[PDB]
């Protein structure tokens, strides 16, 4: 039939998740942001559209930090992005508290991954309208 794109956890007959795909639409439509992995670290850059001369320059900062060694930048629904970072911050604190060592970028990745993947499992939640570029330096690179 049809309407396989009205609920968030439904598989269409060809095995897709339209709500997730639509979420991507929100992303592609957002400001551009990038990440470049250099020889001993990473660099994050982002486009900040001046919708008017009224926006204070150097103010509405987009890039966010998780802990002290992780950087995040995303495109799409900004509010959704902060919500994701806020979760990464607790996710990281929880890790450091028990293991003492600041969270490895790889481990942090999957922490964010499992969280986001979880918002595509239930029709009582909406997927994240953001794609995030993040990274940092840890015990091995």
């Amino acid at each position: 039939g049809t309407g396989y794109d009205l609920s968030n956890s439904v598989f269409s007959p060809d095995g897709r998740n339209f709500q997730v795909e639509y979420a991507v639409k929100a992303v592609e439509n957002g400001t551009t942001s990038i990440g470049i992995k250099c020889n001993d670290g990473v660099v994050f850059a982002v486009e900040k559209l001046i919708t008017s001369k009224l926006l204070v320059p150097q103010k509405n900062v987009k890039i966010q930090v998780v802990d002290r060694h992780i950087g995040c930048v995303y495109s799409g629904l900004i509010p959704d992005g902060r919500h994701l970072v806020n979760r990464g911050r607790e996710e990281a604190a929880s890790f450091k508290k028990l293991y003492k060592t600041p969270i490895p970028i790889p481990a942090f990745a999957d922490r964010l991954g499992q969280y986001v993947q979880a918002h595509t499992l239930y029709n009582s939640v909406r997927p994240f309208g953001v794609s995030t570029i993040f990274g940092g330096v840890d015990k091995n690179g």
Binding site: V61, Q64, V65, D67, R68, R89, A93, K97
Partner: protein, 233 residues
């Protein structure tokens, strides 16, 4: 309701004309056994605040993690974290003060006595105390445990009232504090010869001195003391 196990002794401090000084020996006692010797009981938070802790060491370690998190957190979404919106001594104190009283009120205290020392953004000197009961107070000089009995009487001779602070220099001040550290080594049975000292000067910033030692101790007369009353040899 707990009971302290590995403990830290006195933490003394006072304020001079341009800032404050704070010191604490590097001992971690376990009853009467002077078990640990590389214990730094002076926690610097930023570079305008030093927090000296005495009492249960495990709880101190825990207060330490809270302090580091307070710093990590203040940075979040804070473009002025190292400037206009950096952590002030007064914020750090008020935070601990809160945590301390909340814990005593839950009948599960953090077995410690704490002194937050530093310089406020406007130059002002900050020195305040808080203990496992959540009790707080300020004075030109502050000490915990044994230092409250022996160190205060000494340091107060240097800065007795408020009007004495501007007249006190870092030399005079650091001096009194080192002498006090010596006296405490003479009479406190739970003290060590090695200690750490710190100065937070509104101009020079934070000077953190480690591995100091108690020097110039009078012991010679110990030879002329024999017996306990009538013995002569």
């Amino acid at each position: 309701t707990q009971q302290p196990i590995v403990t830290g002794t006195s933490v003394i401090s006072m304020k001079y004309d341009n800032g404050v000084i704070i010191a604490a020996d590097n001992l971690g006692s376990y009853g009467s056994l002077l078990r640990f010797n590389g214990v730094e009981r002076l926690i610097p938070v930023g570079d305008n605040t030093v927090v000296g802790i005495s009492g249960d060491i495990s709880d101190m370690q825990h207060i330490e993690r809270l302090l580091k998190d307070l710093v990590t957190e203040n940075a979040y979404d804070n473009p002025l974290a190292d400037a206009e919106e950096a952590l002030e001594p007064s914020y750090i104190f008020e935070y601990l003060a809160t945590v301390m009283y909340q814990r005593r009120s839950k009948m599960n205290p953090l077995w410690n006595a704490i002194i937050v020392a530093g310089v406020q953004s406007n130059g002002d000197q900050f020195l305040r105390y808080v203990n496992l009961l959540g009790v707080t107070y300020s004075s030109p000089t502050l000490a915990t445990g044994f230092g409250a009995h022996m160190a205060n009487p000494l340091l107060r001779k240097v800065v007795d009232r408020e009007s004495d602070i501007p007249k006190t220099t870092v030399q005079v001040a650091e001096e009194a504090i080192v002498n006090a550290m010596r006296v405490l080594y003479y009479r406190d049975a739970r003290s060590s010869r090695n200690f750490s000292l710190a100065i937070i000067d509104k101009n020079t910033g934070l000077t953190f001195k480690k591995n100091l030692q108690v020097e110039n101790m009078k012991w010679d007369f110990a030879k002329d003391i024999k017996g306990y009353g009538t013995q002569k040899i």
